[PDB]
Design a protein around this ligand. Structure first.
Ligand SMILES: Nc1ncnc2c1ncn2[C@@H]1O[C@H](COP(=O)(O)OP(=O)(O)NP(=O)(O)O)[C@@H](O)[C@H]1O
Ligand SMILES: CCCCCCCCO[C@@H]1O[C@H](CO)[C@@H](O)[C@H](O)[C@H]1O
Ligand SMILES: CCCCCCCCO[C@@H]1O[C@H](CO)[C@@H](O)[C@H](O)[C@H]1O
Ligand SMILES: CCCCCCCCO[C@@H]1O[C@H](CO)[C@@H](O)[C@H](O)[C@H]1O
Ligand SMILES: O=P(O)(O)OC[C@H]1O[C@](O)(CO)[C@@H](O)[C@@H]1O
Ligand SMILES: O=P(O)(O)OC[C@H]1O[C@](O)(CO)[C@@H](O)[C@@H]1O
Ligand SMILES: [Mg+2]
Lengths: 432, 432
């Protein structure tokens, strides 16, 4: 049974924000998910600016168009889940009345889906008025609109909804599976989680927040095997590596951060790097570098020479193919699900890790496709600072002023199985 | 910061049941946890039978003894978290008033703990009458007590609480971190989860239930390597394993179970065993047998001969010591946490797995210590039926009438490092 997640809530309550986060997360863990924004359907259709009058519960051309757009989107939900093999569809609309929700529920019922509701009720001033100055900012609806008039219009638009707004009821909606999220995550009300996927969605939703904070990601300092062009293993830091540790520690202080939690893997290179900090760290084996299996501690020349076909295949699909007894980047992603969860839940946090692991975490916060993830640039002695914002995440690359080797191998233009060794290793960075 | 879980609710609301499941779960995942039942403190202090009068709001003698039992328990909570190195303490008492909960909360505050409340609510009388028949049955309080009088007395005891009962309020208790469980876990209210452990506790509590059902555990049938006395690998079924598959299918039918979900690992022996039932199934790599690393596909004789230091060590701490590039039973336990979660969430379920995995799962439901876990007996072609009950889990061993080899190796009396090889392999079951 595919799942139909139905957003419920007044405009500017974070329904879309939640819809995007949930959709991105689900896709990241490999569940084909797609969001359907009814407002976008409405914009892409009328093409002409509309005032709040169009949202009035008595307007004809308005109620007509809005219901048609809801049906258009629902038709695409049907196609995605029933025809394209999608697993979860997120239907982003106010859906503030029991009749509309009953309508949508029956739709799901008839098409063989399981419906689950997600209501967002924001009440805190620094959220409502806070989302407006983002609606008023990035919304196509208020482009080239006088500030005071746009702000006023939107307020009357929310009013068009408050008047008939029927929030999910403990008794009247006992039989529905849903979650009510208050004040962007302070409290929650959960009812009738029907299955495994819903239990995971709930778990995720109850762990995200919008508290300002930053996520710092960096690899351990250059190690002995980084110098030799060797992958995997458990080397200690190189001299220049220890030098970086000292630089990270300074950077961290200069940053002046409220309650920084530091995490490292169980590999010496990260722990050693962490020892330079003042703050105590927490080591987790789940953060360990991607296992190369049989190709552990080898160089690329050695892999090509010993495992020539697997090297070519990995080059063809670096996301899905693994070395013998090793992991794929796909595997790594499954392994890091608990890290993604904790990072969502954390506030200010520094993660000292490795190249593959760091690519995965960066792909998550910057929403990079699986195919592009195994190739993201995560240089040594460089600190990636991630600051979550509305719909996105700002990234700042901060080189900590200490040279280091290039462990980054681009994909060669020739990824053929029959290719010669020269072309296979032409992108291999200089080492030793 | 150790955590202080404070149970809240009227008598016969499942506070204790929840306290024991939560305590067992937390310990299983390696978080030193201890529950403190205030009623047991009361029973041990007084020794003599007490009518409802003893619990009266005005009974001066009883108000005092109950106050001495509450503080006694709290002093032990303090000793455990602050002196014994415990991580989580579950304070099991009614704690039905705002003023009481604030006293407890201050205690936690002063001792450097984080307080989290778990309220269990039940306003359904058949459920209460059903529960009482467990209180009236297993409670030391109503031993040798006339049924109608016991039942009556307990009802008046609940009233001693209902009258002053102030449930956790959305507004009044806005600053408290808590979870309210309603309709025996149908709905929930969660407020201010403060950290990672609370987030995991919430996740766990929202996924357990008391819907009657059974958990069936059995290994895959005898395999080619079982015959050879070889551990690990990915062998197929032996002629007997196939025969068992045919026996398990029959047993499953004879059982006449409602909606049986079947799970297997990604190893052929389990899948092949599953292929013989009348119902479909799902496979999971998380269920794969414990990784022996370098000692994969080896025999015990071979392990003693090639890695003597490790066979002796693993023999010393079979829970914590691992083979090189392999897992420890401790690691397996961590790996199976998502399996524990799902099994709790499931109703009627059959898991076709392996020896080490089945030991871990059996240790969870039967609450066997980590030190005893790596040694539980899980014979081939033998089905272990687990039926969860109040505070425990009933276990029925069902041999499916098909002979098989012994893969069970008792801990040899000599586990001394540098021990003679004949003593090291004396408990090795005959094979080939
Ligand atoms: N969420 C729940 N709601 C209702 N009953 C439950 C819940 N969880 C467990 N039970 C049942 O409650 C019974 C166990 O009750 P018990 O734990 O003795 O209650 P209690 O609140 O600790 N009473 P007391 O110790 O007398 O104050 C069993 O029959 C369980 O199946
Ligand atoms: C940290 C110290 C906790 C003090 C616990 C006070 C125990 C008094 O017991 C009280 O009994 C009353 C009727 O008998 C009930 O109504 C109250 O809920 C209960 O708290
Ligand atoms: C930087 C990332 C920090 C990760 C914090 C990990 C907290 C506990 O990690 C836990 O490990 C268990 C098995 O080991 C898994 O089953 C759980 O899903 C995972 O949360
Ligand atoms: C003993 C059998 C229990 C099997 C447990 C299966 C665990 C589910 O495994 C995976 O977990 C991921 C975590 O979010 C989900 O996203 C995936 O959909 C799910 O398949
Ligand atoms: O996937 P790629 O690009 O080969 O990079 C991964 C390698 O990078 C390293 O982190 C160091 O170069 C190795 O541990 C790892 O195998
Ligand atoms: O951990 P123990 O008791 O030595 O035995 C576990 C072994 O049992 C088996 O399941 C079969 O003998 C192996 O796969 C596994 O390695
Ligand atoms: Mg109790």
């Amino acid at each position: 049974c595919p799942t139909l997640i139905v957003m419920v809530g007044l405009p500017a309550r974070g329904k879309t924000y939640i819809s995007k986060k949930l959709t991105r997360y689900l896709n990241f863990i490999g569940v084909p998910t797609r969001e359907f924004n009814v407002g976008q359907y409405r914009r892409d259709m009328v093409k002409t600016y509309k005032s709040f009058e169009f949202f009035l519960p008595d307007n004809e051309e308005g109620l007509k168009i809005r219901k048609q757009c809801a049906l258009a989107a629902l038709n695409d939900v049907r196609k995605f889940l029933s025809e394209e093999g999608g697993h979860v569809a997120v239907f982003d609309a106010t859906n503030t009345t029991r009749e509309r929700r009953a309508m949508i529920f029956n739709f799901g019922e008839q098409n063989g889906y399981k419906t689950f509701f997600v209501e967002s009720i924001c009440v805190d001033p620094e959220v409502i008025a806070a989302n407006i100055v983002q609606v008023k900012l990035g919304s196509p609806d208020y482009v080239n609109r006088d500030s005071d008039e746009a702000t006023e219009d939107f307020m009357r638009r929310i009013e068009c909804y408050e008047n008939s707004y029927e929030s999910l009821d403990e008794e009247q909606d006992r039989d529905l599976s849903y979650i009510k999220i208050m004040d962007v995550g302070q409290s929650y009300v959960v009812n009738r989680v029907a299955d495994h996927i819903q239990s995971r969605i709930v778990y995720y939703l109850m762990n995200i927040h919008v508290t300002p904070r930053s996520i710092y990601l960096c690899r351990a300092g250059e190690s002995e095997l980084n110098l030799k062009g060797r992958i995997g293993g458990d080397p200690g830091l190189s001299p220049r590596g220890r030098e970086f540790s000292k630089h990270l520690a300074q950077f961290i202080s200069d940053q002046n951060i409220k309650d920084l939690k530091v995490f490292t893997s169980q590999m010496k290179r990260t722990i050693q790097t962490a020892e330079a900090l003042s703050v105590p760290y927490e080591q987790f084996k789940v953060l360990n570098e991607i296992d190369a299996g049989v190709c552990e501690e080898m160089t690329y020349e050695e892999i090509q020479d010993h495992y020539p076909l697997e090297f070519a295949l990995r080059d063809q699909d670096k996301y899905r193919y693994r070395y013998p007894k090793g992991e794929s980047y796909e595997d790594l992603v499954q392994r890091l699900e608990p890290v993604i969860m904790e990072l969502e839940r954390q506030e200010n946090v520094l993660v000292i890790c490795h190249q593959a692991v760091m690519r995965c975490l960066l792909a998550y916060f910057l929403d990079k496709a699986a195919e592009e993830l195994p190739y993201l640039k995560c240089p040594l002695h460089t600190v990636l600072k991630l600051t979550p914002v509305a719909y996105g995440c700002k990234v700042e690359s901060i080189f900590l002023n200490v040279a280091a080797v290039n462990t980054h191998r681009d994909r060669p233009q020739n990824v053929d199985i029959s290719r010669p060794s020269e072309e296979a290793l032409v992108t291999v960075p200089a080492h030793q």
